[PDB]
């Protein structure tokens, strides 16, 4: 059964041209297979781009014909898509596949401007209205990193229940944001301590973040 | 191009009862030479699409008898007998009788549970972030289902638009419900035109819509 494994940049600048290799292994290209890109845009929408035949031809969704080349190396049975032109529409996980039969797992492909940045991390301070016996929720807002991902941890890992980290947004800024939250017992907060760990490593960045109470006094 | 539409956009399903669900295209898929390249495929979150079904109702190798496809021309049908865990995730149908090949915008099938209210939050901007220039404000819906779900937000009482962002949880594997995180981003100087800040939230469960808020500085 044949097998593919993609291979791309991760991240390339807009107006650059992109160049991902598609390797096969269980079975050679020059057979009767169609090896097609297809590629998949965050919010999941899947679109097909293009393919190259066991004899060179090739074929393209006309709406990126003018952009898109197809290419192969027969001797190291792989073969390539080379995108012109890239903006951030670009951006997108990038499949080859033989005929819509098997697909490769993909390689995400990032396109900006935006530079390498550590994120901010800000407390999603605990109300001091929260039902007393009952349920507080407190988390860490993760604003302003580039590129993806990050890593969200509570207490070093202690606490894993109650939590949701919820999927990174690109802002109009270029830059993501996301939110880490938990849930735990109102009786709890003042005596437990809950500390948020956050690591960017794209930019070697590790920041710890002890969520509290905000000061309700007037005078404090 | 051909335009394949999928319904419903997301299918309750129960765990031993059976499932159906529709891709139709703009127009008919049988090829000139009478195949109709019509097919299924099964893709689970971080991972790549599987075929299921070719050519409209040929079980690809591998997978369970449960799975059965069927229609012609512009209406088609998946079917499966008894759906199982390991069914859970989103469908896909494509055609590739017509040059641009088309995917449908999928059918994710969830597990049906019964209707949780979310329990909700309001978190104001940091001091911290504040000194920085900007304010996020952050609305948390905590463990609903079903999904469906209204978030607004209001400044002194007048709602907003066009400056919020949402983000939604997996359904979560042990109590099937979902979370989702609303926020709110304003310059530090806008944030400082107006005194009370809520989200209001419409939900199935809720009989009556929930606000949270806070005046700014208190607390």
């Known amino acids: 059964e044949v097998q593919l494994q993609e291979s791309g940049p991760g991240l390339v600048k807009p107006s650059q041209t992109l160049s991902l290799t598609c390797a096969v292994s269980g079975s050679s290209i020059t057979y009767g297979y169609h090896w097609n890109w297809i590629r998949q845009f965050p919010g999941n929408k899947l679109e097909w781009i293009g393919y190259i035949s066991y004899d060179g031809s090739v074929l393209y969704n006309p709406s990126l014909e003018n952009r898109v080349t197809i290419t192969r190396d027969t001797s190291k049975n792989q073969f390539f898509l080379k995108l012109s032109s890239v903006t951030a529409e670009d951006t997108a996980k990038y499949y080859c596949?033989?005929?819509?039969?098997?697909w490769g797992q993909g390689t995400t492909l990032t396109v900006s401007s935006a530079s390498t940045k550590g994120p901010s991390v800000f407390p999603l301070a605990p109300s001091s209205k929260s039902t007393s016996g009952g349920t507080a929720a407190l988390g860490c807002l993760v604003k302003d990193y580039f590129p993806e991902p990050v890593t969200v941890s509570w207490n070093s890992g202690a606490l894993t229940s109650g939590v949701h980290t919820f999927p990174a947004v690109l802002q109009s800024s270029g830059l993501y944001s996301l939110s880490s939250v938990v849930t735990v017992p109102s009786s709890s907060l003042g005596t437990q301590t809950y500390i948020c760990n956050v690591n960017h490593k794209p930019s070697n960045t590790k920041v710890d973040k002890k969520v509290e109470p905000k000061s309700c006094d007037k005078t404090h | 191009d051909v335009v394949m539409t999928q319904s419903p956009l997301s299918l309750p399903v129960t765990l031993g009862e059976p499932a159906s669900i529709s891709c139709r295209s703009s127009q008919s898929l049988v090829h000139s030479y009478g195949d109709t390249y019509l097919h299924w495929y099964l893709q689970k979150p971080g991972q790549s699409p599987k075929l299921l079904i070719y050519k409209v109702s040929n079980r690809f190798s591998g997978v369970p008898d449960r799975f059965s496809g069927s229609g012609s021309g512009t209406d088609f049908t998946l079917k499966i007998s008894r759906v199982e865990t390991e069914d859970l995730g989103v469908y896909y149908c494509?055609?590739?009788?017509?040059?641009?090949?088309?995917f449908g915008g999928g059918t994710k099938l969830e597990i049906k549970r019964t209707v949780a209210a979310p329990s909700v939050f309001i978190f104001p901007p940091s001091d911290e972030q504040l000194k920085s220039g900007t304010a996020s404000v952050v609305c948390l819906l905590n463990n609903f289902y079903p999904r469906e779900a209204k978030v607004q937000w209001k400044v002194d009482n007048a709602l907003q638009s066009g400056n919020s962002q949402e983000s939604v949880t997996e359904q979560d594997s042990k109590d099937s419900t979902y979370s989702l995180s609303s926020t709110l981003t304003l310059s530090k100087a806008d944030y400082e035109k107006h005194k009370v800040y809520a989200c209001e939230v419409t939900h199935q469960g809720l009989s009556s819509p929930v606000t949270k808020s806070f005046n700014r500085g208190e607390c």
């Open positions: 494509s055609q590739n009788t017509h040059v641009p090949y088309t």
């Open positions: 596949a033989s005929g819509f039969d098997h």
